[PDB]
């Protein structure tokens, strides 16, 4: 048990709604992560004070969303700044290859250096869909 709120940010076209489309304008579902049992809402200011964890959405064929990550992430930081919060810059459409601007590297580089976790999907092919919202639910639960 326990209810973990999930948001998903990130500019128009990255693929917010459907990241959103493979979890379920807000999804509620019961979940089970390592063994144990939780219902995980996923919503695609108000929301800054509510969520658990922060699932920063860029593509990866689109580097204009790339660059604008790092002050999206401090907006964030800023809206609560004594709280640790979980975050997780998502690269998504990795699946088209051939219009890739955004490699794996410069994405886990971007992560390190500003305390994220990364991964890379496909939501159009439920690629690392899965884990991504797992992955969510791991760094919420160290936070309890
Ligand atoms: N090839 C590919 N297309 C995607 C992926 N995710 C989303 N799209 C497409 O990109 C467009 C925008 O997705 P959408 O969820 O509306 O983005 P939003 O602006 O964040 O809500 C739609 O045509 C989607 O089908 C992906 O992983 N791969
Ligand atoms: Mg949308």
Same mark, same amino acid.
């Given at each position: 048990?326990?209810?973990?709120?999930?948001?998903?940010?990130?500019?128009?076209?990255?693929?917010?709604?459907?990241?959103?489309?493979?979890?379920?304008?807000?999804?509620?579902?019961?979940?089970?992560?390592?063994? #144990?049992?939780?219902?995980?809402?996923?919503?695609?200011?108000?929301?800054?004070?509510?969520?658990?964890?922060?699932?920063?959405?860029?593509?990866?064929?689109?580097?204009?969303?790339?660059?604008?990550?790092?002050?999206?992430?401090?907006?964030?930081?800023?809206?609560?700044?004594?709280?640790?919060?979980?975050?997780? &810059?998502?690269?998504?459409?990795?699946?088209?290859?051939?219009?890739? #601007?955004?490699?794996?590297?410069?994405?886990?580089?971007?992560?390190?250096?500003?305390?994220?976790?990364?991964?890379?999907?496909?939501?159009? &092919?439920?690629?690392?869909?899965? #884990?991504?919202?797992?992955?969510?639910?791991?760094?919420?639960?160290?936070?309890?």
């Amino acid at each position: 048990d326990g209810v973990f709120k999930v948001m998903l940010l990130g500019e128009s076209g990255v693929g917010k709604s459907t990241l959103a489309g493979t979890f379920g304008d807000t999804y509620e579902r019961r979940i089970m992560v390592d063994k #144990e049992e939780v219902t995980l809402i996923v919503y695609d200011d108000h929301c800054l004070q509510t969520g658990d964890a922060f699932l920063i959405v860029f593509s990866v064929t689109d580097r204009r969303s790339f660059s604008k990550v790092p002050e999206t992430l401090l907006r964030l930081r800023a809206g609560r700044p004594h709280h640790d919060l979980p975050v997780i &810059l998502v690269g998504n459409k990795s699946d088209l290859a051939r219009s890739r #601007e955004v490699s794996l590297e410069e994405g886990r580089h971007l992560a390190g250096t500003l305390s994220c976790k990364h991964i890379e999907t496909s939501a159009a &092919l439920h690629h690392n869909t899965r #884990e991504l919202f797992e992955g969510a639910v791991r760094q919420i639960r160290l936070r309890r």
